Coordinates of C-alpha atoms in Angstrom, one line a residue:
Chain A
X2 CA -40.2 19.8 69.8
X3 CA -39.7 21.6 66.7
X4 CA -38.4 25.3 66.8
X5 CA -39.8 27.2 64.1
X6 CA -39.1 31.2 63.0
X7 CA -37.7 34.2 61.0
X8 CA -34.6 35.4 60.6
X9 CA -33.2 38.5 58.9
X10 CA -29.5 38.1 57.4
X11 CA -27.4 40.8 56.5
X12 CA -28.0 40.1 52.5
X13 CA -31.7 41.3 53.1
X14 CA -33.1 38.0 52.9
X15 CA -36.1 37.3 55.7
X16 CA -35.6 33.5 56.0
X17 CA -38.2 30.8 57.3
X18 CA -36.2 28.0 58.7
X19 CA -37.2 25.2 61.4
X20 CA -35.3 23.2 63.8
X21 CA -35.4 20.3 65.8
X22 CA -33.4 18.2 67.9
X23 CA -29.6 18.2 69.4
X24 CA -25.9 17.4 69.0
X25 CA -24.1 17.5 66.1
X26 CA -25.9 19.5 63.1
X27 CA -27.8 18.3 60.2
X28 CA -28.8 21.0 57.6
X29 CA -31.7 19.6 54.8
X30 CA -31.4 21.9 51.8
X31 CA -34.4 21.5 50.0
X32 CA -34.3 21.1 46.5
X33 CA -35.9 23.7 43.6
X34 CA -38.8 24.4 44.5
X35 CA -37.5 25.6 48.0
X36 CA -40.4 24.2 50.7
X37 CA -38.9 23.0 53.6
X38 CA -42.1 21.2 54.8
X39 CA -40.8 18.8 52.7
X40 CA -38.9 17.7 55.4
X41 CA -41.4 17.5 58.4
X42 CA -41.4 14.0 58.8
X43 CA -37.7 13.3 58.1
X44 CA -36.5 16.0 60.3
X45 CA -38.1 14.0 63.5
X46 CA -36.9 11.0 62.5
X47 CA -33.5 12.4 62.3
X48 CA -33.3 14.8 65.0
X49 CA -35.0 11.5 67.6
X50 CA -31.4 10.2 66.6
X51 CA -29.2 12.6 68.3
X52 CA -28.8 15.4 66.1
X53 CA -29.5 18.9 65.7
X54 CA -31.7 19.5 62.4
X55 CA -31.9 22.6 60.6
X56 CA -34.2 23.2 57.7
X57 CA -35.7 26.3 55.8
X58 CA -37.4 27.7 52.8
X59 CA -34.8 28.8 49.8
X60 CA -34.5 32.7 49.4
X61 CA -37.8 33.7 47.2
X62 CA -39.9 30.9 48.2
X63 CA -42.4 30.0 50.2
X64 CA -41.8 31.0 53.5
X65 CA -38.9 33.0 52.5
X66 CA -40.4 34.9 49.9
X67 CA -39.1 38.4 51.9
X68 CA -36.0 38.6 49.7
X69 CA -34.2 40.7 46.8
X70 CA -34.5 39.5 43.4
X71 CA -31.3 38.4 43.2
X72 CA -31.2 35.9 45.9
X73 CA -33.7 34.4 43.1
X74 CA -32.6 35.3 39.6
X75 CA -29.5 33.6 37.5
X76 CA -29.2 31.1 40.6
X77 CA -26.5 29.3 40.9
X78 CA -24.8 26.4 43.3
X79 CA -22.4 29.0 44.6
X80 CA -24.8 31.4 45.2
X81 CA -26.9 29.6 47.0
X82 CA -24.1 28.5 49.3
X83 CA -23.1 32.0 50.1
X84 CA -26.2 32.5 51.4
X85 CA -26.5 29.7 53.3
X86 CA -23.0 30.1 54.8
X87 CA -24.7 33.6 55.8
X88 CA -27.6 31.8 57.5
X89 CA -25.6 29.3 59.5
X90 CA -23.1 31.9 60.9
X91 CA -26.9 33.8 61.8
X92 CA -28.1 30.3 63.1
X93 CA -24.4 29.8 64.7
X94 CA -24.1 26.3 62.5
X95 CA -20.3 25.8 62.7
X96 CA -20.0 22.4 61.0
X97 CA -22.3 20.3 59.7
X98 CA -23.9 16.9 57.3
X99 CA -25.5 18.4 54.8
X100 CA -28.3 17.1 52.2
X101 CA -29.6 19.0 49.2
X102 CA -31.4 17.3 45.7
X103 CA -31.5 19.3 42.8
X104 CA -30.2 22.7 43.1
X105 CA -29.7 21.9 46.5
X106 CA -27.4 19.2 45.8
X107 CA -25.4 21.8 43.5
X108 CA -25.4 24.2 46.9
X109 CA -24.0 20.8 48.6
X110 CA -21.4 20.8 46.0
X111 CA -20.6 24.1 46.4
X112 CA -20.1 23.8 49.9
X113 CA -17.9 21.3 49.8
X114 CA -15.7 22.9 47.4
X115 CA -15.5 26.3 48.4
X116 CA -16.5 26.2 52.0
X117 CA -15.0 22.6 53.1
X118 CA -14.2 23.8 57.0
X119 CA -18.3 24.1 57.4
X120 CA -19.1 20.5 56.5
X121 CA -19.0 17.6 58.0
X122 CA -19.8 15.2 55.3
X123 CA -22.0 16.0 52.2
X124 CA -25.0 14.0 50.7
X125 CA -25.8 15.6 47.2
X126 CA -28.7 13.6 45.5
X127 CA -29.2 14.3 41.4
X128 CA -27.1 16.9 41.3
X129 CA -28.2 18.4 37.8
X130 CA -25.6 18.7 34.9
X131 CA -27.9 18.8 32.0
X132 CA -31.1 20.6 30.9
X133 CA -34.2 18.2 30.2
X134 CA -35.8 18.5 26.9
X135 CA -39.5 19.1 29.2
X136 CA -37.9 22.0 30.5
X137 CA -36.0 24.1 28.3
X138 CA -38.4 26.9 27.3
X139 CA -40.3 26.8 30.9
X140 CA -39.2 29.7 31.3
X141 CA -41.1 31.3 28.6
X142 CA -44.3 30.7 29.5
X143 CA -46.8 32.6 31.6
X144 CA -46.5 32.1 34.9
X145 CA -50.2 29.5 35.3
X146 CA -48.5 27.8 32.1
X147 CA -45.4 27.3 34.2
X148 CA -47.3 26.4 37.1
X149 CA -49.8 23.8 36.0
X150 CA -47.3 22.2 33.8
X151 CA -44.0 22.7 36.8
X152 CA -46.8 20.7 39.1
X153 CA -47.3 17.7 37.3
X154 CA -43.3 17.2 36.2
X155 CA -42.8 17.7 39.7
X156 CA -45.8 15.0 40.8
X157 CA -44.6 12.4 38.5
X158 CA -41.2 12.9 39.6
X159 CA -42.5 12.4 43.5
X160 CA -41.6 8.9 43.1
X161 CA -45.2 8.5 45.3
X162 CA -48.0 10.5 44.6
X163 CA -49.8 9.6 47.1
X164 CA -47.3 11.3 49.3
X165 CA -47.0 13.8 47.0
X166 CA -50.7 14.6 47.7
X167 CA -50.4 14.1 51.2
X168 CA -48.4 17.3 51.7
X169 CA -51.4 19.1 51.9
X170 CA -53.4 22.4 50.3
X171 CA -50.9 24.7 52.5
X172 CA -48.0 23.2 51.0
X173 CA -49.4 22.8 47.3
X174 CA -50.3 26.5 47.5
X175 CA -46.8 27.8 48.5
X176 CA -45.3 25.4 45.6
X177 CA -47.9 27.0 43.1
X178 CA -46.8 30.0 43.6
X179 CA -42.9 29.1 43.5
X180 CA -42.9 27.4 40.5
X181 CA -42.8 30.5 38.1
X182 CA -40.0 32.2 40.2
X183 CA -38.3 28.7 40.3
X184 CA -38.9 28.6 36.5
X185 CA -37.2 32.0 36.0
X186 CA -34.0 31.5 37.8
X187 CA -33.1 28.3 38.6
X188 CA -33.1 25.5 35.1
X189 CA -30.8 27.9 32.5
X190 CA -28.6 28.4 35.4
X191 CA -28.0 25.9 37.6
X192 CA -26.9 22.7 35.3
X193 CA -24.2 24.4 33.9
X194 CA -22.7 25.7 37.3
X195 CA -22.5 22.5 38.7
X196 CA -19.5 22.2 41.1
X197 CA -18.4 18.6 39.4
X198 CA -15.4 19.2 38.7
X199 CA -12.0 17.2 40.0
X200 CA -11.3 20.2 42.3
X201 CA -14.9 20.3 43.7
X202 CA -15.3 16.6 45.1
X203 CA -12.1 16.2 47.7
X204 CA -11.8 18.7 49.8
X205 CA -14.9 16.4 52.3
X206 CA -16.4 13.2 52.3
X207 CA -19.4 13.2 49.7
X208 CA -22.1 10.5 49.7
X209 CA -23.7 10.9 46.6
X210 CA -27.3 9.1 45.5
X211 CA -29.8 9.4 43.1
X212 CA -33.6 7.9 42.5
X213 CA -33.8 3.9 42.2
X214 CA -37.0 4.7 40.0
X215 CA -35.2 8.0 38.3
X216 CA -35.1 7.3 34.7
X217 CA -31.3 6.1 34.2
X218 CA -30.3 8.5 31.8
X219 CA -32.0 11.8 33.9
X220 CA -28.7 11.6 36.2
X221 CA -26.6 8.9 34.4
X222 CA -24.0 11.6 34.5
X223 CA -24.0 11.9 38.4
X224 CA -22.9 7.9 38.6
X225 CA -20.2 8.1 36.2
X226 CA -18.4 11.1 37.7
X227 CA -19.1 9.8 41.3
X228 CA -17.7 6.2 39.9
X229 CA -14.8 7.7 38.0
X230 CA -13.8 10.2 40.7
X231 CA -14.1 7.4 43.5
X232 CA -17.0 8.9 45.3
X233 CA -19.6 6.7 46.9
X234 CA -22.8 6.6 45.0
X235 CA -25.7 4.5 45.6
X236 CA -29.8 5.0 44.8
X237 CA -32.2 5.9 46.7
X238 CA -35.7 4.5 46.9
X239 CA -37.7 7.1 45.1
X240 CA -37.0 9.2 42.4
X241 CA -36.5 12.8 43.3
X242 CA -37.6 13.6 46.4
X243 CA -37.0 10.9 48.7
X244 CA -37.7 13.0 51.5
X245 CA -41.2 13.0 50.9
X246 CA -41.8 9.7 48.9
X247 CA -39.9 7.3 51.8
X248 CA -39.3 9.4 54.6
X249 CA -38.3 6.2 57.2
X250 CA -35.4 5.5 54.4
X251 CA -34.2 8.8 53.8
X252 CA -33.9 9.3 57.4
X253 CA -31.9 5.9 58.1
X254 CA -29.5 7.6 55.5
X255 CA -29.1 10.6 56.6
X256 CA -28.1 9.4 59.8
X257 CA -26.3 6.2 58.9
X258 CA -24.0 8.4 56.4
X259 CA -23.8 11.7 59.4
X260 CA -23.0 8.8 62.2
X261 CA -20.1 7.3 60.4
X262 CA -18.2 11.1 59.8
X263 CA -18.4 12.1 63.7
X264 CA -16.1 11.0 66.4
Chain B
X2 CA -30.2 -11.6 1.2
X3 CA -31.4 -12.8 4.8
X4 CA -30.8 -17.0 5.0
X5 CA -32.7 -18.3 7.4
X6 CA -32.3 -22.2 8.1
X7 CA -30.9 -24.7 11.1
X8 CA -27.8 -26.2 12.1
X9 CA -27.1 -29.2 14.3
X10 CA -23.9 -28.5 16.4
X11 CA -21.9 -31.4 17.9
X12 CA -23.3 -30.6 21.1
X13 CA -26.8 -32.0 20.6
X14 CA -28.6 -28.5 19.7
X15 CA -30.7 -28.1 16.5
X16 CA -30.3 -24.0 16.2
X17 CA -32.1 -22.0 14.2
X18 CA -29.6 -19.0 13.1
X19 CA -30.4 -16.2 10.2
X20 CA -27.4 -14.5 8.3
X21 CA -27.4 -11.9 6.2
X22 CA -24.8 -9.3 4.6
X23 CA -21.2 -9.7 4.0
X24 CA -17.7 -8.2 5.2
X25 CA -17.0 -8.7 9.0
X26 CA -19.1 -10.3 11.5
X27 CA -21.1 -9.2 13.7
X28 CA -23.2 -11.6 16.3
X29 CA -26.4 -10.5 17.8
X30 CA -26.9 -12.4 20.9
X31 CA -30.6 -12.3 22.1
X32 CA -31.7 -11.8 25.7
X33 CA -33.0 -13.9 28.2
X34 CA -36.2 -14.8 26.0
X35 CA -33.6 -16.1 23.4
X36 CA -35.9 -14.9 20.5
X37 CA -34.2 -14.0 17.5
X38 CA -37.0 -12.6 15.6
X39 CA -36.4 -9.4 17.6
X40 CA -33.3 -8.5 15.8
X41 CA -35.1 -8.8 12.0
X42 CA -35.1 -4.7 11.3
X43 CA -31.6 -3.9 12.8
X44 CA -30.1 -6.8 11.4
X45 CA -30.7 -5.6 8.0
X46 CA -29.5 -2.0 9.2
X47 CA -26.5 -3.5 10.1
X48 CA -25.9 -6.0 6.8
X49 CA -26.4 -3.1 4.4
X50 CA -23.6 -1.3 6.1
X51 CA -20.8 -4.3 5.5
X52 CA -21.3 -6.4 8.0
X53 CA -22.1 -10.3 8.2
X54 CA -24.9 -10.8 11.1
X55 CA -25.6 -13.8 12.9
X56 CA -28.6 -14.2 15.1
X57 CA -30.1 -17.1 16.0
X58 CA -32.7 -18.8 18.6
X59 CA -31.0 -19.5 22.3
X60 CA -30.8 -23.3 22.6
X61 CA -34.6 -24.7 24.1
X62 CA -36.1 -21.6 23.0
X63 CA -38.4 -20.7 20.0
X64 CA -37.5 -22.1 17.1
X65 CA -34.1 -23.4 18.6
X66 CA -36.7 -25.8 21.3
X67 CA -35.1 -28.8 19.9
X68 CA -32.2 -29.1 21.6
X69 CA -31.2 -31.2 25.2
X70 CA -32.5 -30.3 28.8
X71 CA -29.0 -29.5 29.7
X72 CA -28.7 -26.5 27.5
X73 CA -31.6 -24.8 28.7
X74 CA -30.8 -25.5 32.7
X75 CA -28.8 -23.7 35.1
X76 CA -27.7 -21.3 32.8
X77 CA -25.0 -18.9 33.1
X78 CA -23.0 -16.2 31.2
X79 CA -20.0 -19.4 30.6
X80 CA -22.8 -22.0 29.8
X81 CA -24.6 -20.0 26.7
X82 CA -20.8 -19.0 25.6
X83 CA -19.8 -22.4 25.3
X84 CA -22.5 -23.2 23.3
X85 CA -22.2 -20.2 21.1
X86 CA -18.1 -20.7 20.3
X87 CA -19.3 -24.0 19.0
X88 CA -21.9 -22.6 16.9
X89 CA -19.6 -19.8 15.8
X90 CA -16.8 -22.7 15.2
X91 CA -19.7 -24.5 13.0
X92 CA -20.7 -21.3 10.9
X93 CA -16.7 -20.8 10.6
X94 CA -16.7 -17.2 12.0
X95 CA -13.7 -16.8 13.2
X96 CA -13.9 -13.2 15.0
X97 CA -16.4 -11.2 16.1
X98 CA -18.1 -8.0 17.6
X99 CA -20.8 -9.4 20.0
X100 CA -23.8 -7.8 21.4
X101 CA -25.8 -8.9 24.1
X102 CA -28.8 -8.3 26.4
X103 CA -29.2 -9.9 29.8
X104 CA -28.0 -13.3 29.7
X105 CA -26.7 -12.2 26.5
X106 CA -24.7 -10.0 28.2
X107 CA -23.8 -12.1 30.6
X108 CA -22.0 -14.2 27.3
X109 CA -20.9 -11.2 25.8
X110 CA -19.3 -10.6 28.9
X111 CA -18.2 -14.6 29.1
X112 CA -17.0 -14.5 25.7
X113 CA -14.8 -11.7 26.2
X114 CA -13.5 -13.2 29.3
X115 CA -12.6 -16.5 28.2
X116 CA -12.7 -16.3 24.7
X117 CA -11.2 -13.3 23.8
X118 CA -9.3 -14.6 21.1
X119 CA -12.6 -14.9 19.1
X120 CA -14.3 -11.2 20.3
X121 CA -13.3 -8.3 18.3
X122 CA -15.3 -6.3 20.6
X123 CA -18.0 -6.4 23.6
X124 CA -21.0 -4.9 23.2
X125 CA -23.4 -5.9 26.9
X126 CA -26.2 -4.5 27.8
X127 CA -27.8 -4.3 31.0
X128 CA -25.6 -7.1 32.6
X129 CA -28.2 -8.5 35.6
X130 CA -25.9 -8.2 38.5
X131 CA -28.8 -9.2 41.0
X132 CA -32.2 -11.4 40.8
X133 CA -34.9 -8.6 40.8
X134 CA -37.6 -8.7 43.1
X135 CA -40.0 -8.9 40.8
X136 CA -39.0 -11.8 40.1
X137 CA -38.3 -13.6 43.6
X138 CA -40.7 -16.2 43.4
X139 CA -41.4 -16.4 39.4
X140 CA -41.6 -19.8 39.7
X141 CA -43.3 -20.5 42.0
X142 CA -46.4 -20.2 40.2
X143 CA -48.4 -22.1 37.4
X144 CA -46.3 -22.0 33.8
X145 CA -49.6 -20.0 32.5
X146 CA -49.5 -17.4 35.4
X147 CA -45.5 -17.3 34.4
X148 CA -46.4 -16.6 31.0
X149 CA -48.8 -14.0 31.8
X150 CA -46.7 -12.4 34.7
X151 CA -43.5 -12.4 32.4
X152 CA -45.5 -11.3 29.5
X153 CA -46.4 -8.2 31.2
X154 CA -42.8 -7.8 33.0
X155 CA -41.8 -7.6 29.3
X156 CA -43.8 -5.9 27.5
X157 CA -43.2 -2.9 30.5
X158 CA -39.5 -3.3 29.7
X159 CA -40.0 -3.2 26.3
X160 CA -39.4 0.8 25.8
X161 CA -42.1 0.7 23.7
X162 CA -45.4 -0.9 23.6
X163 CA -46.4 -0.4 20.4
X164 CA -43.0 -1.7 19.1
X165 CA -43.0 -4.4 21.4
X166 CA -46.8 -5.4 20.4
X167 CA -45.7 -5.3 16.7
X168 CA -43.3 -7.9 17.3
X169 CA -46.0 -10.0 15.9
X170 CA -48.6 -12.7 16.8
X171 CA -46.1 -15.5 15.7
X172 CA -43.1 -14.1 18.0
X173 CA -45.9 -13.7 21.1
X174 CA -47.4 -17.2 21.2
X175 CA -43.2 -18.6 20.7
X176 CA -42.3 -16.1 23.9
X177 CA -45.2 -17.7 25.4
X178 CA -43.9 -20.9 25.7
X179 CA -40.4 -19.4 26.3
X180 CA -41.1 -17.6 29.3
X181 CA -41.5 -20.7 31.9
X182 CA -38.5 -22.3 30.5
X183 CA -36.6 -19.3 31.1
X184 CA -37.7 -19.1 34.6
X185 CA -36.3 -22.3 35.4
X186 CA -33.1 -22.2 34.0
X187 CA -32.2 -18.2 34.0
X188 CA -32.8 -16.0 36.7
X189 CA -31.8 -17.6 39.6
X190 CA -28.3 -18.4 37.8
X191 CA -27.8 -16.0 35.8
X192 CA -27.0 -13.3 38.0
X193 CA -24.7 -14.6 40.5
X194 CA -21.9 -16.1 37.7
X195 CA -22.0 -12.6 35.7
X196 CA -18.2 -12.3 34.4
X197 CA -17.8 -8.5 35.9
X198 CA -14.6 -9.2 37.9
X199 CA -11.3 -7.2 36.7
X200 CA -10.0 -10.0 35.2
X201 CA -12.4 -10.4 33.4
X202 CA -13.1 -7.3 31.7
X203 CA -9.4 -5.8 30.2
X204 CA -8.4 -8.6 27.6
X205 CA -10.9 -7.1 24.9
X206 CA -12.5 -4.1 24.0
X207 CA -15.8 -3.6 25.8
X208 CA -18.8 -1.0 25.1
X209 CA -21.3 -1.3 27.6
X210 CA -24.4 0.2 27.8
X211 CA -27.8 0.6 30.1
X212 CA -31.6 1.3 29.0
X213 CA -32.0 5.5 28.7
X214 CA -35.5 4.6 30.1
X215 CA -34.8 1.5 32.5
X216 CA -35.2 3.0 36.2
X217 CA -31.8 3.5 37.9
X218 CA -31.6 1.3 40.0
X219 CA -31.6 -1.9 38.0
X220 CA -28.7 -1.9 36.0
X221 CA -26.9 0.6 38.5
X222 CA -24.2 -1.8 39.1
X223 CA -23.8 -2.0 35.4
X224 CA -22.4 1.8 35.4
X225 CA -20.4 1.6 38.7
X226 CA -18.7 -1.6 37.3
X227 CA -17.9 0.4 34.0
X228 CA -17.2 3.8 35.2
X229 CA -14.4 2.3 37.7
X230 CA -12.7 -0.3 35.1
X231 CA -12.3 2.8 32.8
X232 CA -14.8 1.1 30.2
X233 CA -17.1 2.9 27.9
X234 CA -20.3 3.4 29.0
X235 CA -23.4 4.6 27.7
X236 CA -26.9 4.9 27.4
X237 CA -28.9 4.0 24.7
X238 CA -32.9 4.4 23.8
X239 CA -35.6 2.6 25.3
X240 CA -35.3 -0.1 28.1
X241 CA -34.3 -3.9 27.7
X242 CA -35.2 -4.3 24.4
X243 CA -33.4 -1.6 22.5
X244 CA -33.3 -3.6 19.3
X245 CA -37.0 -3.7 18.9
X246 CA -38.4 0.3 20.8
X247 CA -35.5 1.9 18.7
X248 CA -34.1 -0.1 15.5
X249 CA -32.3 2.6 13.8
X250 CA -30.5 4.0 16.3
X251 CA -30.1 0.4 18.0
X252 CA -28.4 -0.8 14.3
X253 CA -26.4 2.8 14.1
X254 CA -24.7 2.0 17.5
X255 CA -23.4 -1.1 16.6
X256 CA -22.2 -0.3 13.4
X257 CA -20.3 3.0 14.9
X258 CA -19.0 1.5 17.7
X259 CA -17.7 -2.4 15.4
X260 CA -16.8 -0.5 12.8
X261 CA -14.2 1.8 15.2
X262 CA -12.1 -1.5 15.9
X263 CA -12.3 -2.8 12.6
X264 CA -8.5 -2.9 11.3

């Protein structure tokens, strides 16, 4: 049965966040554009195999929208982490296996590097170090500009558009409307931040993937450090969201990669 | 300028070869399609700034078709490298920097590993590590449907369609005939005898690079392989067929990167 609510933390932020299952925790960050129905299907899967999944909408979007402009401007992985660290001491999350793409993989990062007693085991997927050309001045546009154009990116990046389509008006309506905030806070910021740095890979076991159909240079970075730094990496069918385009695979990693960090 | 002739090594093949330029040499292996024709516009890039080129026809392929069964069966990365020290022996180059693609890559890689006393330096790209499933059961099907399916396979690798198109009527009806032979002699073998082992990649310099376009997932092992050896590794334009979607920056790589060994 999946739990689904509000929640208020002390930082002013009104979160929407769902749950499902039991035993050890499992925490889906979602990934830019902040919609945690993304993870619907996953989450079942995941939670059917004996663990407790948490999931939610980032702080401005979607669901989550009930939240000061900061927790959405000049974003960062670090930022985002102290928030989430917030929400899992609200949610009473001690430990967990945590998953994040994008900006959410740069909140994984962080995590592991400055809050390394809180996870279990981290799964960062293309983890963003660089600024695509396409983007670069999205954040100059108007805000229908940013949407229409943020929409397609994101649809050819769904690595299934049928999927993609699939997640329904609701869904596509929320992401519409996150796209310009996203736009706004997230691309200047977030590359450059990213916790990959020596330091910011050892303190926890990382399992790090990115998109078998991702164009190779998009996160060629990623493999490199991961390779150099002797950090698993390893693709994932898809490109960037996984989640959505193979749901029965991303699941089977998630747990495969969780099962092998607990006792 | 450019000579273009054939040669009749000691080991039965009647090669076609084109050399151009002068000062130290520089050998353009071609992929699996063994069609030198591809290489016409770099090649002159790369004369005019003091180099020798060598190219020539892979042995059973294009204009290089007369030549024994044997060296067009059960290839691998040590096969095509004997075969090219004796033509290197016959065109008395002594030393040189080698690129490759594929199953050229596979000799570059050969060459560097056994014959590293004629390399100067390595320069693979996208070293096939594993039989694609694409192409599974390539031959398993009529030689026309190979040449159609293989045809299109290409051409979608090609990084550039209207590059790849421009190759010319002449070079499309000689890859015609290529592509069945190269389906029965490549693929399957190709793969499984790539020279990637640590001992085989330290005893000369190596610059290995991956399609910028080519999804991730196919040449992932290429990076991995790199990244942990401590060898250079890059990207370049395009997918499999650099050398004909970007020429000029194809032609400026190789010169940069022989020209920093030269001594």
């Amino acid at each position: 049965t999946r739990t689904r609510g509000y929640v208020t933390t002390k930082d002013g932020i009104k979160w929407y966040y769902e749950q499902e299952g039991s035993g050890p925790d499992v925490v889906l960050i979602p990934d830019g554009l902040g919609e945690c129905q993304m993870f619907d299907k996953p989450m079942s899967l995941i939670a059917s195999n004996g663990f407790r999944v948490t999931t939610f909408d980032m702080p401005g979007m979607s669901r989550s929208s009930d939240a000061p402009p900061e927790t959405y401007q000049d974003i960062t992985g670090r930022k985002l982490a102290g928030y989430i660290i917030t929400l899992l001491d609200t949610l009473d999350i001690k430990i967990a296996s945590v998953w994040g793409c994008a900006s959410g993989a740069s909140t994984v990062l962080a995590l592991c590097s400055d809050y390394p007693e809180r996870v279990r085991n981290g799964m960062p997927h293309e983890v963003p170090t660089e600024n695509p050309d396409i983007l670069l001045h999205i954040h100059e546009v108007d805000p229908a500009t940013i949407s229409q154009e943020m929409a397609a990116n994101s649809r050819a990046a769904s690595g299934n558009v049928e999927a993609w389509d699939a997640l329904g008006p609701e869904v596509h309506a929320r992401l519409h409307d996150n796209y310009p905030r996203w736009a706004y806070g997230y691309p200047r910021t977030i590359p450059p931040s990213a916790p990959v740095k020596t330091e910011d890979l050892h303190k926890v076991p990382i399992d790090w993937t990115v998109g078998a159909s991702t164009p190779t240079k998009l996160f060629f970075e990623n493999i490199v450090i991961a390779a150099r730094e002797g950090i698993n990496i390893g693709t994932l069918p898809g490109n960037h969201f996984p989640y959505v385009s193979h749901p029965e695979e991303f699941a089977k990693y998630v747990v495969e990669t969780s099962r092998k960090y607990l006792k």
